[PDB]
From a paper:
Among structural proteins of Sarbecoviruses, spike (S) protein is responsible for receptor binding and mediates membrane fusion between cell and virus to initiate infection. RBDs in SARS-CoV-1 spikes were observed to be in the “up” and “down” positions making the spikes exhibit open and closed conformations, respectively. We introduced these three disulfide bonds in equivalent positions in the SARS-CoV-1 S sequence generating three spike variants: S/x1 (S370C and D967C), S/x2 (G400C and V969C), and S/x3 (D414C and V969C). We determined cryo-EM structures of SARS-CoV-1 S/x1, S/x2, and S/x3 spikes and we identified various previously undetected conformations for SARS-CoV-1 S through classification procedures.
By cryo-EM, only symmetrical S-trimers were observed for SARS-CoV-1 S/x2 and S/x3 spikes. The S/x2 spike adopts symmetrical locked-2 and closed conformations. The S/x2 spike can adopt a symmetrical closed conformation, spike protomer of this conformation has an empty lipid-binding pocket and disordered FPPR. Therefore, S/x2 closed protomer has almost identical features to the S/x1 closed protomer with a disordered FPPR (compare Figs 3E and S5A). Under native conditions, x2 disulfide is more resistant to reduction by DTT than x1 and x3 disulfides, likely reflecting different local chemical environments for different disulfides.
Author numbering:
A (entry chain A): 65 to 70, 84 to 92, 97 to 106, 112 to 125, 161 to 166, 180 to 224, 231 to 237, 249 to 309
B (entry chain B): 703 to 808, 836 to 1046
C (entry chain A): 900 to 1123
D (entry chain A): 556 to 662, 671 to 702
The structure:
Amino acid sequence: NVTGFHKDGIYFAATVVRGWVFGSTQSVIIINNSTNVVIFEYISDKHLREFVFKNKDGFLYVYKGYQPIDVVRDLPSGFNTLKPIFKLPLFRAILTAAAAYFVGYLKPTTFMLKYDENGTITDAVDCSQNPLAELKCSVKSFEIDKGIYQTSNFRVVP
Amino acid sequence: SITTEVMPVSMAKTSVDCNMYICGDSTECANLLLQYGSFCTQLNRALSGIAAEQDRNTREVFAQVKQMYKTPTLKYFGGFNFSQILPDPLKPTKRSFIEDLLFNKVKFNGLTVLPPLLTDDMIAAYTAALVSGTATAGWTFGAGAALQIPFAMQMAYRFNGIGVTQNVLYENQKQIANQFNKAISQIQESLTTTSTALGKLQDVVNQNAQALNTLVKQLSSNFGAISSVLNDILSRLDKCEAEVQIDRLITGRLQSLQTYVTQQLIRAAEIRASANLAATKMSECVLGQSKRVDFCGKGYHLMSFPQAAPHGVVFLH
Amino acid sequence: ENQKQIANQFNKAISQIQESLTTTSTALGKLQDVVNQNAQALNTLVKQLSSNFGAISSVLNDILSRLDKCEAEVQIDRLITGRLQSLQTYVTQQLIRAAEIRASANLAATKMSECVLGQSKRVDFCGKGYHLMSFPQAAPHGVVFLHVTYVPSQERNFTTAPAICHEGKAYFPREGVFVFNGTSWFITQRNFFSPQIITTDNTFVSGNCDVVIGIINNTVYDPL
Amino acid sequence: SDFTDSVRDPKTSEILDISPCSFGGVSVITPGTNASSEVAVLYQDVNCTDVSTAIHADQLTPAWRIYSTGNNVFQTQAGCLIGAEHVDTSYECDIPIGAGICASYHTQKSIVAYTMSLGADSSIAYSNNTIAIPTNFSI
Ligand SMILES: *[C@@H]1O[C@H](CO)[C@@H](O)[C@H](O)[C@H]1NC(C)=O
Ligand SMILES: *[C@@H]1O[C@H](CO)[C@@H](O)[C@H](O)[C@H]1NC(C)=O
Ligand SMILES: *[C@@H]1O[C@H](CO)[C@@H](O)[C@H](O)[C@H]1NC(C)=O
Ligand SMILES: *[C@@H]1O[C@H](CO)[C@@H](O)[C@H](O)[C@H]1NC(C)=O
Ligand SMILES: *[C@@H]1O[C@H](CO)[C@@H](O)[C@H](O)[C@H]1NC(C)=O
Ligand SMILES: *[C@@H]1O[C@H](CO)[C@@H](O)[C@H](O)[C@H]1NC(C)=O
Ligand SMILES: *[C@@H]1O[C@H](CO)[C@@H](O)[C@H](O)[C@H]1NC(C)=O
């Protein structure tokens, strides 16, 4: 589920000056311009661009991506992966300048990724979505012939 | 004179959860067991294969007819009284007298016993159809299509197969019928009086019970740790002094579970050999007459009737 | 009398089994199962090599490039113990599987020794029905038999009788049974309907027709 | 096996028996991912009124996020099935389940469960003065 605007790490995507703030409110500032990037005053030098933020062990990972999309009000269903860009040793974000941004949440779950020859990420299916998905995740193959299989054990949490 | 011969076919299907047996409900114990990477899925796969092998054994033994036959309304074929072998419609249960007197003669650990694919009535239906086909269609219903023969002429043919001419049978049929009825009554009395005649099936059940009991009892040892209960370890130590005790419990319980799996594999191999022998015995002794000496019964062989048994088959040669 | 019909049935059977072997994909289940079991054992051994067994790292060269010769000894000991356990488990599973394959090989050996080089009178050991011969063929890590069988069909009802008597003497068939046909009686064999006239050549005498149940009054042709 | 089974209550001095609440192995039955993508789930040896209540209260540790079905529940002696419809007609067994139940993928198609079929049923008539003789054969 994602919130359309026409905890433990958040997901960002946006269809334009974009800024971020992080704190318990001295201030942690991230400002992205058209050409320059300004960030502990670290200074460095349609379409859909995706930033993945995560935080563990006193470190914060920032990942970036890019994909050319079609001009439409919602977001089309598609497949793309994003590479890491940087990592730093140290939730709502404001942007300004017809524009939209969407936020999804992160959960600790297991995936299973299919590579290829000359291969980036080509296909992936989740391991905690469907019983068929759990079966694919357990037999460790994309094609399962007819039969009965045992995957895991069920238990009721008190 | 008729004689009995008991064989095992299948043993008790079972399964063991690796995460429930070794660790309790602590997720850190799941992490420490995941350090011993990809180990306890092998045991579960082996026991699943064992259960599939048990179902294969029962299916390969009993289901050797492509069609079945209705139980005849009359149980008297020329002086041969068959009321003790074929099932009777009076009882609400559809089992014969021999089968009914022979069936009556013999959690916190994640242990489960899966039910068999075929129930008792399933096997009883197979046995009743097979016996009726022997009694009516003669020796040609598994070797091709069924061909109905009167019982006296089939007896004459089987005597001719032994080496005795037909006139010997047809001159003294009543004496042979009386001997047959006395033999059935004698074997019924011998089955119902004593308590030790089904040794092998009781031995299989007792061996499986002893293995499960000694596994459950071996769970209760501390393996050199300060206590034998994992929850008492996790309620009395921090996350660097309890790790070594958890490691010792993991190692000991892993050794015990691996030993139980190996013993189960060897025992299943022995039961598979017995099941294949029983399958070829019934395929070469009920559906036909065997000229191999001393393979079915003592002396010369005429025919044989199978009966069901708890995890087994009982022949009457 | 009907060699050409049997030859045509033989050729149709060979063509049918060739088509059935070439169309489907699941007929050689057992050899594929053996290969897949061996591959799974090797794969899980190689994957189990990649675990650390509670040590600080799962690569031995990384242990020997980051510790001295008294702090790396305990980690080396843990790797030795874990990999020893894995290798011993693989050896035990291989021994049991080899025992199963040895049993199957002995069964196949005695099957071909008692079914190709000779004709077996054991029912339902080679093929369904009666057995004529068998041809072996090679297979990847195995042998494939082609048993040829002779099965009867097109059954017909008849009226039968145990024995007949002509002048106070019981007559019993030599090899075969008595069939009424709706006409005068005939003698036949038990697997193919080919009637013949009752004659003293294929019939033998024993006793009188007073004690055997179901004697029929009928004539016995003597060839003079 | 040195297991805490019964406890005297430390305050009112009554008797409490301790049992482990429901758990077991789970299995999935599929017709193979070449005909469809719908599967069915078998929960082993539980009277799964408990399982239905606990999954409508969202307390099962196998976290099926989008899977929630309670319209097709069938009870067997090996456990209970969610995702299959009970059919009284007998057919030859396609995949084994236990206690004489076999699932299959016959009729639009769906997963159906039924009772084991013995085979081709027939009945040969007996008479004590009739014989049967074949007249033809096929190699
Ligand atoms: C066969 O034996 C049973 C044994 O109780 C008996 O009841 C029945 O009458 C017998 N059948 C006869 C004598 O035809
Ligand atoms: C033989 O006769 C019986 C009754 O007379 C009949 O039910 C049966 O079908 C017949 N057999 C064949 C092969 O026609
Ligand atoms: C058998 O009976 C038929 C009449 O149904 C008759 O035509 C035939 O000749 C008989 N068989 C022989 C060998 O005579
Ligand atoms: C066949 O059974 C009937 C039924 O009792 C009997 O009357 C007849 O005598 C039997 N047939 C022969 C040849 O004995
Ligand atoms: C303990 O406390 C309970 C709760 O107030 C009280 O009912 C009880 O009398 C006290 N004493 C004992 C011995 O249980
Ligand atoms: C399951 O429990 C309910 C209520 O306790 C009961 O009515 C039902 O019969 C139980 N199911 C079985 C198979 O015993
Ligand atoms: C056996 O059946 C085939 C096919 O129906 C037929 O051509 C052949 O003539 C039959 N055999 C005899 C001996 O009639």
